[PDB]
Design a protein around this ligand. Structure first.
Ligand SMILES: *C(=O)N1C[C@H](NOS(=O)(=O)O)CC[C@H]1C(N)=O
Length: 263
């Protein structure tokens, strides 16, 4: 219908699959396209990982400033922050900021270990009412993005609903929610994705993912307009099925534009 056609055309031009869910928290209006289909999370799970850390900080005093000593064996490719602190270590909060804002892989594994692994993060997501999210593997294996594999996936609607609960709703206490918002607002990896769709004088917090298959990538965000209620949205892609020419970032930005225009 009228709502789906601009997304279907964008998806047809892209050649893969796109999933979009957006909610206007002022009016309750939504935009939905393949919003209940599963897509690989890849690095985007790191936002929810940081939220799970903050949930634990409601119960364990001093957790955030607790140093985690790690060695070279914890490092994996794309660990730009943790590679600089081998001899000094990093605190839980510093690891969380690195995982969110630089998508640091070693930091994400260290925090997963603190939380009881992929099963522990999945249990946290269940505890906030997310029945779709599943994390099954660690970095780097979780990025495999095998078509039809449900491991390490969620849906755009579940991502958006969980993000809303954690940044604007009641799933975290206010100081924790503000810290999550601040980490998302300072993300450095999303400048070509949802942020490319928003007016400059708005504000955005986001977390990206870029899977091991070109064309499978994603971004979710809270967007704060001027003078009206925030919008929460998620845009996920799956690569065309049966070398950097998939323009996945442009597709994510274009889908975000349609959502913000149509809302
Ligand atoms: C996350 O999906 N990853 C971490 C890193 N940065 O990508 S992101 O900025 O889009 O999050 C490299 C790609 C990927 C990975 N393979 O771990």
């Amino acid at each position: 219908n009228l709502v789906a056609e601009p997304f279907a055309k964008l998806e047809q031009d892209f050649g893969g699959s796109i999933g979009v869910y957006a909610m206007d928290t002022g009016s309750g209006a939504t935009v939905s396209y393949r919003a209940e289909e599963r897509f690989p999370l890849c690095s985007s799970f790191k936002g929810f990982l940081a939220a799970a850390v903050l949930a634990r900080s409601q119960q364990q005093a001093g957790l955030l400033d607790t140093p985690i000593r790690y060695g070279k064996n914890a490092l994996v490719p794309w660990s730009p922050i943790s590679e600089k602190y081998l001899t000094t270590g990093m605190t839980v909060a510093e690891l969380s900021a690195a995982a969110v804002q630089y998508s640091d892989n070693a930091a994400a594994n260290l925090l997963l270990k603190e939380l009881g692994g992929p099963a522990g993060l999945t249990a946290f997501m269940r505890s906030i009412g997310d029945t779709t999210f599943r994390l099954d593997r660690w970095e780097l294996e979780l990025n495999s993005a095998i078509p039809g594999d449900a491991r390490d996936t969620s849906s755009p609607r579940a991502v958006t609903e969980s993000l809303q609960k954690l940044t604007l709703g009641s799933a975290l206490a206010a100081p924790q929610r503000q810290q999550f918002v601040d980490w998302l607002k300072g993300n450095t990896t999303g400048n070509h994705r949802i942020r490319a769709a928003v007016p400059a004088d708005w504000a955005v917090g986001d977390k990206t993912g870029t899977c091991g298959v070109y064309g499978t990538a994603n971004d979710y965000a809270v967007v704060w307009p001027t003078g009206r209620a925030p919008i929460v949205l998620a845009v996920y892609t799956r690569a065309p099925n049966k070398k950097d020419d998939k323009h996945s970032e442009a597709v994510i930005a274009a889908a975000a534009r349609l959502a913000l225009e149509g809302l």
